[PDB]
Design a binder for this molecule. Structure first.
Ligand SMILES: [Mg+2]
Ligand SMILES: [Mg+2]
Ligand SMILES: [Mg+2]
Ligand SMILES: [Mg+2]
Ligand SMILES: [Mg+2]
Ligand SMILES: [Mg+2]
Ligand SMILES: [Mg+2]
Ligand SMILES: [Mg+2]
Ligand SMILES: [Mg+2]
Ligand SMILES: [Mg+2]
Ligand SMILES: [Mg+2]
Ligand SMILES: [Mg+2]
Ligand SMILES: [Mg+2]
Ligand SMILES: [Mg+2]
Ligand SMILES: [Mg+2]
Ligand SMILES: [Mg+2]
Ligand SMILES: [Mg+2]
Ligand SMILES: [Mg+2]
Ligand SMILES: [Mg+2]
Ligand SMILES: [Mg+2]
Ligand SMILES: [Mg+2]
Ligand SMILES: [Mg+2]
Ligand SMILES: [Mg+2]
Ligand SMILES: [Mg+2]
Ligand SMILES: [Mg+2]
Ligand SMILES: [Mg+2]
Ligand SMILES: [Mg+2]
Ligand SMILES: [Mg+2]
Ligand SMILES: [Mg+2]
Ligand SMILES: [Mg+2]
Ligand SMILES: [Mg+2]
Ligand SMILES: [Mg+2]
Ligand SMILES: [Mg+2]
Ligand SMILES: [Zn+2]
Lengths: 66, 100, 51, 108
RNA sequence: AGCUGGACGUGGUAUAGAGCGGUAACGCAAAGAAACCCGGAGACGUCAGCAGGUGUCACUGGAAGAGUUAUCUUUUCUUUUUAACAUACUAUGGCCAUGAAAUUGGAUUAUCCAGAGAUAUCGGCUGUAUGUAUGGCAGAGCAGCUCAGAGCUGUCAGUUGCGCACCUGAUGACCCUUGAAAAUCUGGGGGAGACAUAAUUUCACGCCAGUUCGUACCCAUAACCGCAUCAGGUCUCCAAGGUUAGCAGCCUCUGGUCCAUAGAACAAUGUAGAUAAGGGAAGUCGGCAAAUUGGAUCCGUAACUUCGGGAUAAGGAUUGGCUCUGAGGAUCUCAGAACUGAAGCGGACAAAGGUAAUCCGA
RNA sequence: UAGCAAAUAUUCAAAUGAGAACUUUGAAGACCGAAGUGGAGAAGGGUUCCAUGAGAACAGCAAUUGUUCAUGGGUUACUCGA
């Protein structure tokens, strides 16, 4: 499992059978890409990055929420 | 220093005339200990009664743990314990209940 | 113990099968004297040779 | 107090058989098999025995897994020698040839 | 999640010969190659102490549950967890600069190091995690509370230990002892060959595979060997609290167990266990057996001797409880005084009886 | 008849059964006391493991119980070992 700090690489990865898993925690939110040998997590604190990334969900990738 | 408060929900027993808010109140005032004192309720600590509930407010650090303790002792004195149990209703409140 | 040869496994299996009782319907044949299987064996009282 | 169980069918305590106690998300204390430590890489020259810098100390296998960096250094003998030995080598070679030529001209 | 072997795909390194940075240690996803020759790891004794980490144990505030409640107890117990693996940082040592040290310094508990360059610099590089943070991860696990399979709440924040078991790190001591090898992974020196529409390259991400055999269960006061369900014998790992020098004994928690044919009487004789007034080996081949002694602290300690020893020699005292006082340290030991008991107090447990000669064998 | 006496220990109620000091649940009292009567292995054993059922025999008293009898069922690996 790898995690990503900078949204850019994350977006290069979800731009590269693709599905995206978003999960809510009290203080934080996480976005999760499945790829052959790695599970990519992306965490953010503030709601701005949050909504912005929710926007970022493309038609190619389907969004699952737990 | 902090503002703390805790709510003991005495609702059920009052209705059947088992608990008397009045006496539970006195009891609590008696058994509450500051720095080893049974009586110095010194102003930092405050107790209120309602028909269904009791409220404890304090500037001085306190834990509802203590409230549960005292309550239990009360219940054992009133021999109610095979009937009533105290439980945690909310973070800040402890409710009384009958089982069966 | 745990560790075994094939040979072993197979031999043990063999003796395990051979250790069944005479099938209750064989005693009803016309030409047989056999009431029971005389060759049955109990692990505790008699030991096999496997090394 | 939690007690453990070997997981390997080797109950004897051998340098290769070592175990470490790990605490799981389950709340269990589980034996996990710990690997063996290896000796750091030393310069290969005679009597030298210096610990090489900038090379990874890794169990022999993992050496196929690492990046070129850890396998090496940038000197003339990067992997095999330390600087001191390199230096002394250079110097010695140069000066020795000098004496060689000198003997040559003194012969001719 | 990782590994090895395949085989191409897409990106990217490098070159008209073959990365770039730093004075230097060295650095950075990648940066051409055969024979050939050399390496590193694998690859190693015993013991002694030091340092760190893991697990465990202890303690602190918060929350949920449970035990106690005539009296006392802001109480007593319980849960409060984090896998391999990914990235970044720190980690007992070693190096590189700069500069050289005598009124020699530095440094460890111990050694030990220095002009063959010590100490020291807002210096720098590097090596090892059973470390930290995040990912994994909470969605799992755990603890509570509801509803009639669905649901809700909390799983938080600290401190210390010559404590203990293991591991690691840096050392030290020892030998008329000096403590495997190979497979395997990898590095260096060398530059013969190969190649323009080309050639070759320890970068990423993607595609494919991993066969055969062993995996039950006992490992013992009932699954083994002792003709047996035999008081014998049979190689290992994990280990909690209290007392304590202690992994001893004694008592406990986790987990396990009450299985050893039973009932009643209570004579002799017996097997095992204890105690005997006065004397004290008179018993007996013989002090056989029993008894005495026993810890720790303080006193005191001969002849003899191979000067190491003898040596707990011999011997003499003290030991509880309670209330105070002083001293040793970081950003748990030691000593004093007073009071109080049927003068008891290593209260169980644990735990030498001495001395003087003779003979052997060092 | 000798004898069934080592390894501290059992007791109460219910249930099941023709039958219970010896089986199962619960309630008490004790033991091993993490150098274990605990949790797992190697050697050795080879199905003794699991479930259901049970007449005799065996489990040196007993048994409704079993390491016993009968019937069925259990041992999955690129990373553990060979
Ligand atoms: Mg995978
Ligand atoms: Mg309840
Ligand atoms: Mg075998
Ligand atoms: Mg036998
Ligand atoms: Mg035999
Ligand atoms: Mg591959
Ligand atoms: Mg050594
Ligand atoms: Mg607490
Ligand atoms: Mg350093
Ligand atoms: Mg949850
Ligand atoms: Mg230590
Ligand atoms: Mg050991
Ligand atoms: Mg040596
Ligand atoms: Mg080369
Ligand atoms: Mg035996
Ligand atoms: Mg009797
Ligand atoms: Mg006498
Ligand atoms: Mg006398
Ligand atoms: Mg006398
Ligand atoms: Mg004697
Ligand atoms: Mg002396
Ligand atoms: Mg003395
Ligand atoms: Mg003497
Ligand atoms: Mg005294
Ligand atoms: Mg004193
Ligand atoms: Mg006195
Ligand atoms: Mg005494
Ligand atoms: Mg004597
Ligand atoms: Mg002798
Ligand atoms: Mg007898
Ligand atoms: Mg037993
Ligand atoms: Mg056992
Ligand atoms: Mg077992
Ligand atoms: Zn060297």
């Amino acid at each position: 499992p790898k995690e990503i700090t900078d949204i850019k690489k994350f977006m290069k990865l979800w731009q590269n059978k693709k599905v995206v898993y978003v999960k809510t925690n009290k203080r934080i939110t996480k976005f999760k890409l499945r790829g052959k040998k790695y599970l990519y997590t992306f965490k953010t604190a503030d709601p701005k990055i949050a909504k912005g990334i929710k926007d970022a969900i493309p038609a190619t990738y389907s969004k699952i929420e737990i | 220093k902090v503002n703390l408060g805790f709510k003991i929900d005495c609702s059920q027993p009052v209705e059947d005339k088992v608990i008397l808010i009045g006496e539970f109140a006195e009891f609590l005032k008696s058994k509450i200990k500051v720095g080893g004192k049974l009586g110095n309720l010194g102003e930092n600590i405050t107790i209120s009664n309602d028909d269904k509930k009791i409220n404890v407010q304090s500037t001085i650090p306190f834990s509802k743990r203590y409230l549960k303790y005292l309550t239990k002792k009360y219940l054992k004195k009133q021999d109610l314990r095979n009937y009533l149990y105290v439980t945690s209703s909310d973070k800040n409140s402890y409710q009384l209940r009958y089982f069966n | 113990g745990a560790n075994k040869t094939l040979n072993m496994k197979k031999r043990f299996g063999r003796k395990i099968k051979q250790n069944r009782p005479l099938p209750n319907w064989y005693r009803y044949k016309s030409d047989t004297n056999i009431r029971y299987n005389s060759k049955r064996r109990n692990w505790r009282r008699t030991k096999l040779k496997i090394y | 107090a939690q007690r453990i169980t070997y997981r390997r069918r080797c109950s004897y305590n051998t340098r290769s058989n070592k175990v470490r106690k790990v605490k799981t998300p389950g709340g269990r204390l589980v034996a996990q098999y710990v690997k063996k430590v290896v000796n750091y890489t030393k310069c290969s020259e005679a009597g030298c025995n210096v610990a090489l810098n900038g090379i990874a100390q890794v169990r022999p296998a993992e050496y196929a897994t690492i990046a070129r960096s850890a396998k090496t250094v940038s000197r003339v003998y990067g992997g095999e020698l330390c600087h001191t030995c390199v230096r002394s080598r250079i110097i010695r070679a140069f000066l020795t040839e000098e004496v060689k030529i000198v003997k040559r001209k003194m012969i001719s």
